[PDB]
Amino acid sequence: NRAFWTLNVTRSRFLDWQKVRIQENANEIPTGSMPRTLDVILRGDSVERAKPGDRCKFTGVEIVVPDKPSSTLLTYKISFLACHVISIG
Amino acid sequence: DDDNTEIIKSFKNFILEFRLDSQFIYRDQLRNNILVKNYSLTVNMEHLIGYNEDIYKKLSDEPSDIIPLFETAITQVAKRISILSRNSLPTFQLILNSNANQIPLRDLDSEHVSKIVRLSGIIISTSVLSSRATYLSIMCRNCRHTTSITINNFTVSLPRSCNCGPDPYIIIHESSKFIDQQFLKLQEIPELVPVGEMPRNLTMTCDRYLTNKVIPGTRVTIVGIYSIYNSKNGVAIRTPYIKILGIQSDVETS
Amino acid sequence: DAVFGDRVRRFQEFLDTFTSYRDSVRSIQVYNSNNAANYILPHRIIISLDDLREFDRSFWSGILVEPAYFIPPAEKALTDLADSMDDVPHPWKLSFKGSFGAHALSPRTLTAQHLNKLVSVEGIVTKTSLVRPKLIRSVHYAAKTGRFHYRDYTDATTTLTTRIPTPAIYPTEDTEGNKLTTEYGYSTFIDHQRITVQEMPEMAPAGQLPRSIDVILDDDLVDKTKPGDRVNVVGVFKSLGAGGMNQSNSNTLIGFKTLILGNTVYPLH
Amino acid sequence: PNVSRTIARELKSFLLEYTDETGRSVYGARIRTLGEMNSESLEVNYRHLAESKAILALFLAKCPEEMLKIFDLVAMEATELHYPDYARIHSEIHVRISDFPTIYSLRELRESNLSSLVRVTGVVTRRTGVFPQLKYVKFNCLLGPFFQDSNEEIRVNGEKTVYRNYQRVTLQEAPGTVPPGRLPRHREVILLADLVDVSKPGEEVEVTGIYKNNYDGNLNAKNGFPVFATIIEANSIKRRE
Amino acid sequence: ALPSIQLPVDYNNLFNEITDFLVTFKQDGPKYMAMLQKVANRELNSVIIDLDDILQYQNEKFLQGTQADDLVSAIQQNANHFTELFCRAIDNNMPLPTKEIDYKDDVLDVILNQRRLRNERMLSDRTNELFPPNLTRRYFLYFKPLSQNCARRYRKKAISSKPLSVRQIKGDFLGQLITVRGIITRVSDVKPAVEVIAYTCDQCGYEVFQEVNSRTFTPLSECTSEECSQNQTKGQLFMSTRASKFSAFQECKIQELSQQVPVGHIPRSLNIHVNGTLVRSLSPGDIVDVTGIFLPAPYTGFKALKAGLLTETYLEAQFVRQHKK
Numbered sequence A: 001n002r003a004f005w006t007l008n009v010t011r012s013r014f015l016d017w018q019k020v021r022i023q024e025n026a027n028e029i030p031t032g033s034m035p036r037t038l039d040v041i042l043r044g045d046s047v048e049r050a051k052p053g054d055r056c057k058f059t060g061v062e063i064v065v066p067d068k069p070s071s072t073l074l075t076y077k078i079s080f081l082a083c084h085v086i087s088i089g
Numbered sequence B: 001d002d003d004n005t006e007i008i009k010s011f012k013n014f015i016l017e018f019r020l021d022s023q024f025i026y027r028d029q030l031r032n033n034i035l036v037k038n039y040s041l042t043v044n045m046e047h048l049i050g051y052n053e054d055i056y057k058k059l060s061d062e063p064s065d066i067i068p069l070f071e072t073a074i075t076q077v078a079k080r081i082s083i084l085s086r087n088s089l090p091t092f093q094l095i096l097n098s099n100a101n102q103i104p105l106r107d108l109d110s111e112h113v114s115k116i117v118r119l120s121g122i123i124i125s126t127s128v129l130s131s132r133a134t135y136l137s138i139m140c141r142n143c144r145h146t147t148s149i150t151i152n153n154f155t156v157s158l159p160r161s162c163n164c165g166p167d168p169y170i171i172i173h174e175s176s177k178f179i180d181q182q183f184l185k186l187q188e189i190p191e192l193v194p195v196g197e198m199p200r201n202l203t204m205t206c207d208r209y210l211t212n213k214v215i216p217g218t219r220v221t222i223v224g225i226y227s228i229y230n231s232k233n234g235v236a237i238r239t240p241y242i243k244i245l246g247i248q249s250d251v252e253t254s
Numbered sequence C: 001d002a003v004f005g006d007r008v009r010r011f012q013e014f015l016d017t018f019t020s021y022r023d024s025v026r027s028i029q030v031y032n033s034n035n036a037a038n039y040i041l042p043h044r045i046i047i048s049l050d051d052l053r054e055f056d057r058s059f060w061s062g063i064l065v066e067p068a069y070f071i072p073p074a075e076k077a078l079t080d081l082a083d084s085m086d087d088v089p090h091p092w093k094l095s096f097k098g099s100f101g102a103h104a105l106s107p108r109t110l111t112a113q114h115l116n117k118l119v120s121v122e123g124i125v126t127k128t129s130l131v132r133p134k135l136i137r138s139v140h141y142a143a144k145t146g147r148f149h150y151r152d153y154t155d156a157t158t159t160l161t162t163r164i165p166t167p168a169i170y171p172t173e174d175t176e177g178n179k180l181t182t183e184y185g186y187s188t189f190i191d192h193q194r195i196t197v198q199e200m201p202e203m204a205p206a207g208q209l210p211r212s213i214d215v216i217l218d219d220d221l222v223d224k225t226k227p228g229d230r231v232n233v234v235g236v237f238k239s240l241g242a243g244g245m246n247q248s249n250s251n252t253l254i255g256f257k258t259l260i261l262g263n264t265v266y267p268l269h
Numbered sequence D: 001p002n003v004s005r006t007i008a009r010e011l012k013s014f015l016l017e018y019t020d021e022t023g024r025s026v027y028g029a030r031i032r033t034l035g036e037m038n039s040e041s042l043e044v045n046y047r048h049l050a051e052s053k054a055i056l057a058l059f060l061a062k063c064p065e066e067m068l069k070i071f072d073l074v075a076m077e078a079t080e081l082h083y084p085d086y087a088r089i090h091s092e093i094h095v096r097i098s099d100f101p102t103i104y105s106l107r108e109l110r111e112s113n114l115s116s117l118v119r120v121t122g123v124v125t126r127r128t129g130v131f132p133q134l135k136y137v138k139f140n141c142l143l144g145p146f147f148q149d150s151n152e153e154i155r156v157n158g159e160k161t162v163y164r165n166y167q168r169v170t171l172q173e174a175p176g177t178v179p180p181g182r183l184p185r186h187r188e189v190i191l192l193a194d195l196v197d198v199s200k201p202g203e204e205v206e207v208t209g210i211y212k213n214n215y216d217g218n219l220n221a222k223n224g225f226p227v228f229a230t231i232i233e234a235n236s237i238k239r240r241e
Numbered sequence E: 001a002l003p004s005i006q007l008p009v010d011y012n013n014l015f016n017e018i019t020d021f022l023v024t025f026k027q028d029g030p031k032y033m034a035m036l037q038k039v040a041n042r043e044l045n046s047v048i049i050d051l052d053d054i055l056q057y058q059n060e061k062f063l064q065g066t067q068a069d070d071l072v073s074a075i076q077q078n079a080n081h082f083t084e085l086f087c088r089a090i091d092n093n094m095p096l097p098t099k100e101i102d103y104k105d106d107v108l109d110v111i112l113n114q115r116r117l118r119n120e121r122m123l124s125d126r127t128n129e130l131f132p133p134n135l136t137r138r139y140f141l142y143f144k145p146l147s148q149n150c151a152r153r154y155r156k157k158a159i160s161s162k163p164l165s166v167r168q169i170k171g172d173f174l175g176q177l178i179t180v181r182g183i184i185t186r187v188s189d190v191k192p193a194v195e196v197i198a199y200t201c202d203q204c205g206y207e208v209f210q211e212v213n214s215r216t217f218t219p220l221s222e223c224t225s226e227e228c229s230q231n232q233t234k235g236q237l238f239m240s241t242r243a244s245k246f247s248a249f250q251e252c253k254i255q256e257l258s259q260q261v262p263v264g265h266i267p268r269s270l271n272i273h274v275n276g277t278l279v280r281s282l283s284p285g286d287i288v289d290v291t292g293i294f295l296p297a298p299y300t301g302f303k304a305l306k307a308g309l310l311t312e313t314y315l316e317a318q319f320v321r322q323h324k325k
């Protein structure tokens, strides 16, 4: 195969996750700025630990996610990962 | 299809032999209808069930596979009445209106799907007419096969066989016989049973001689089959409509 | 199809006995040559339906009942008579005055008994879709093999009758492998437009919504009417497009959109 | 498994001769009620099932899916011995299964809840209209009956098919119970059969439905990852409470 | 299979008549020698061909024989074909040296110069089918309308050059030069277009030139070169931007002057493409008689909807005359 894929979801363990879009704090940014947000997806048990309207410190694992050259016999952007979360800040 | 012969023989025998003491109500319903050029027939189910219980046993079972064998059955009769030989004569529409038991709009949930359902509601607005097809010729893009397709009711893809493919069949519109269609949309009556919620509206397709029969806003009692269409908007989630045969307005209403 | 020939030989006779139309064709052939000698007229000959009944009722009932099989052989016959005229130095068009009607109908009353049959609609025209070219005759030049190469494009509204669709693009290197450049300005473009027609506002029965149907206006007829004008269209009533029955997509009862081809467009007040 | 059939032999015993409050079997009286009402929802208290044995209650927190299919056929057997009929009425009764704590609210959910029946609660948001689902497939021939599905349908005929009403309602978490600085996340709810129309927008509703995923479903464009949808296939419906 | 029907007009000897039109001239040495050499001298790009003089030439070639086939009607009858035909003749009569041309001097001329040097060298070594004539130009041919004070010859009906209404425009004017007039609308900002764009290979090199035809083209990879081909195995090739020949491209729509609008209807704009030197000539809000071949550029698809083919067209700019200098 070839053939069907085929999708079986009972044998496949799952985990987490929740995306948060992280934005720079307003005290640092020199308006006129227009602060640049970026995606951080929380994978791991640190899921849900994050709160809206508050500063958080993360574990980096920057990676990249698809969204320039081609792969011949691609469009990418920075999507930050965090496997740990804290309410510091 | 000797079974269809067996059913149609029973429908002919129902039209020609039916006697209300002593005029034949249907047989004359027919003549007096072809003369005015109405090309329709209205069966009264009580007479039907009186005549044979059987044919109503099947007609309330699988209506949409049967009712057209009843249409062809009656038009094969108007051939022997309205004309004589040794054209063209469309297959008449039958409109059957009967008492039964009123089934309110809220209480239609599955389970009776493809079983004739009499009901009552105020029509909201009538949709602009559009033609479906009845008899259309078709030629192939390559081998040029001349096929006359009799489309019936009650969607239907075209046949691919006389490379060739995948679907090399063109509709000839110079010879194709067309009928009409309406799309009523009816809001159930305000008396019952709104409770605290906005009343639901089932979409209905009238056709041929029932079309433009009803001004929007008039209370009516529809009969018709109950059935479902696809209309991509998953999964699977097919949405409900009521085919109408046939409509009868409330008293009078003219 | 010897019967299509019959239709042509039959319509031939109608002209030149009586000759009352032929003088108008001659007038059309002469006026343009007069413009050739100078220092615009659409080529179509209005046919009064009035005269058709005097000769043959059989051919009269046909133009109304089944115009697809009749208007085009009569037309090919009109071109054939225009070429026997004088002299050298186009499909034309029929018109059909009338002598209405049957077939008299306002757009509100129509569909389907009146479909595939000549019709004179009348009502208000809105919103008058914007005027646009439409490709018909493909013309090309081969070199160095030369000659002159042409393809003929058949659209949905080509002639009247349905035909296996030619479109689209260009042949490009018809055999043998010679290069073919598109020759623009020899090739023929018939202008094309459509305009929807609403029934007359004053004969509207009730608060029931107005029902409008669309009329395609071929050739000269284009830009002859601003929107909001009283119009009596004529034309063959055509149902084009599949109802969805052709391919799987889409799923729904709705189908066979209809429109009127041609034809005349007599304005009125 | 075939062993599970023997489980049926036990649960039927729980279904009829089980007694409480000094005699007068409760589930016998429920079967008698519908029964006369013929509303085709047989209702089994989780408290009692857990009271008799914790081993089945544990099966409800592990694998409700195939066990309800094992269970309700037996319920149909019990109704069959009590009313030697309903071969003509509905021929299926799916059990409602009252309160099952848990009592996870909304926003607290994880992967650990997959395939396992879980109670949820919160306000209803405007609900879709009632669109009959395909369910069972049957035809005059002409392959045989094909059950599809919940919810895939891979990998149409129809003659007489038994339709069952579908309805999808979006359940949002109750505004009063929201912890400050957090948005009221919400989940999709799939009603079936009689549960349909029991809900109305604006109201808090208690649902026992099991949790489901399938099948990605559709993102693959803006996620970055193989992320499944979250849909609670519903079981029972109750007012608040 | 695709029938053919002869026409009285033939381009073969008409080309001959073009060649006799060029470099053999009296009435205005001749103007086509100097006007051409000043381009060859590379101080000049736009070649403005007046149809007026084409009119003057026929008189000398008719009455005043020996009689020949007509151009002025035959040009504006087609007018696209002559850009690829009437203009290629210039290549045959052009002064070769011409004077003091050098190499650099010019950017990108050195590229092609070294192309033909290495090509000549490597070919003359290999023997011990050529770069297309459209890549080597560096000039543009533009026809102009005959109004004209001398159009009174008279050839009468010969004039379009009829400063016509946008409403007057018909589907029977496609592929025929037509002057139009109106206010400039939206006047889109200039962007580079493309013509050849010869991509560069890798292993064994050479070159291949892909024609830019109609609106768009499909890019190719494979290998065209026989050397990289099949051994071993297929050479990789990329487009070189320095090597390509760019022609300025600016599009703008023109609404009618609104006095030319009847009691009814609506102002109708007409889309106009600009190339080469004529670029930036047009400015928004300015009434201008714009002349050009009137052409379709299909279809890019869609292609389902129309059906067909429903060209929708545009006007190629050729000459520009604005009211009120």
Ligand SMILES: [Zn+2]
Binding pocket: E201, E202, E203, E204, E205, E206, E223, E225, E227, E228, E235
């Ligand atoms: Zn190479």
